[PDB]
Structures are given as C-alpha cells and as structure tokens.
C-alpha cells in the first residue's frame, strides 16, 4: 500500500498523468487529494454490484 | 440577507457547504439562501456553459 502514494505525488507535482494497474485501494479513488491516477482493475471496495 | 455561494473542487468544499447549511438551517435569523453552484472549468471550451 505504501509506494503507489510517493510514486503518485513524485509524478503528480508535475501534474503528469499516472497509469495504475496492480492495485486497487479505495484510498487512490478519491479524486481530489490524488491529483492523476488511473486504475485499470476495479477498486477492492466496487465488488457490492455483484 | 441574501446571497448564494459559487466554487470549484477542492478539498473541502462540501464540508464547507455543509457547515453553512446546517449553520443555517436552525436560527433566529432570517437567511434567504438562493440555490447552490457546483461549477468547475476543468471542460475544455466549457466557458460557454
């Protein structure tokens, strides 16, 4: 859970965007305090469709 | 006694809104509060609407 925030605001102080794709915290979901972050699986917590 | 508020996203907006609402809801004061506005200019060629 740890190095995806440092690697997210490393990139996202320059306002570039950011490509996730082995994680899916709901923490990274918000869409505020995390500038860029994409997220090619659905988040952990998006399993209460099923 | 009248206005009405405009921001963008930030964080904390909607618990600012939030406060002034509640705040609001229950006083001895009449406070005339004329709708809420949520607009943001991250749309590209948006200024339109």
Do not use: C
């Amino acid at each position: 859970h740890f190095t995806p925030t440092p690697v997210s605001y490393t990139a996202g102080f320059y306002r570039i965007p950011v490509l996730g794709l082995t994680t899916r915290m709901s923490i990274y979901s918000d869409k505020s305090i995390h500038l860029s972050f994409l997220r090619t699986v659905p988040p952990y917590s998006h399993q209460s469709s099923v | 006694y009248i206005f009405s508020i405009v921001t963008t996203y930030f964080p904390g907006y909607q618990d600012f809104v939030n406060k002034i609402r509640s705040t609001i809801e229950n006083s001895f004061v009449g406070w005339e509060l004329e709708e809420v506005l949520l607009l943001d200019m991250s749309l590209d060629d948006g200024d339109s609407k």
